[PDB]
Amino acid sequence: WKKGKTVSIENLNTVTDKYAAALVPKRKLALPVLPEGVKKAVEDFAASVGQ
Amino acid sequence: WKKGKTVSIENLNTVTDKYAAALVPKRKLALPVLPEGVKKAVEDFAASVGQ
């Protein structure tokens, strides 16, 4: 915020990115979510065999 | 094979299809091969996590 100026939302948002980039832990488990791009490519491969 | 005619290879091959369609069993286990279309979509999903 400058003296007579205003505050852009493109700077209020990169500040909020700095708050939510410290919400991640400094060392974390890479707990994998199965994406739907590969959870359907293995579901229908079982459905093409008939499971 | 007709009397004075010849034998086409498009009829010698559909005869060979009838020999190799009785090589399949009348009741079979649907033993699934994993295709490379889904064995790579689950390999790199483990390689994007770093396994």
Features:
2 chains, part of a larger assembly, 51 residues, elongated
Concise synopsis of the structure shown:
Chains A, B: This is ATP synthase associated protein ASA1. This is part of a larger assembly, with 2 copies of chain A (51 residues). Chain A is mainly alpha-helical.
Number of strands of chain A: 0
Helix content of chain A: 40-55%
Q: List the chains of the largest interface with their residue counts.
A: A-B, 12 and 12 residues
Helices and strands of chain A, in N-to-C order?
A: HHH
Anisotropy-based shape of chain A: elongated
Radius of gyration of chain A: 22 Å
Counting DSSP H or I runs of 4 or more residues, the number of helices of chain A is 3
Helix- and strand-based class of chain A? mainly alpha
Q: What oligomeric arrangement do these chains adopt?
A: part of a larger assembly
Rounded to the nearest angstrom, the distance between the terminal CA atoms of chain A is 61 Å
Note the main sheet of chain A.
none
Beta-strand percent range of chain A: under 5%
PDB class: proton transport
Keywords: mitochondrial ATP synthase dimer flexible coupling cryoEM, proton transport
Entry title: CryoEM structure of Polytomella F-ATP synthase, Full dimer, composite map
Chains A, B: ATP synthase associated protein ASA1
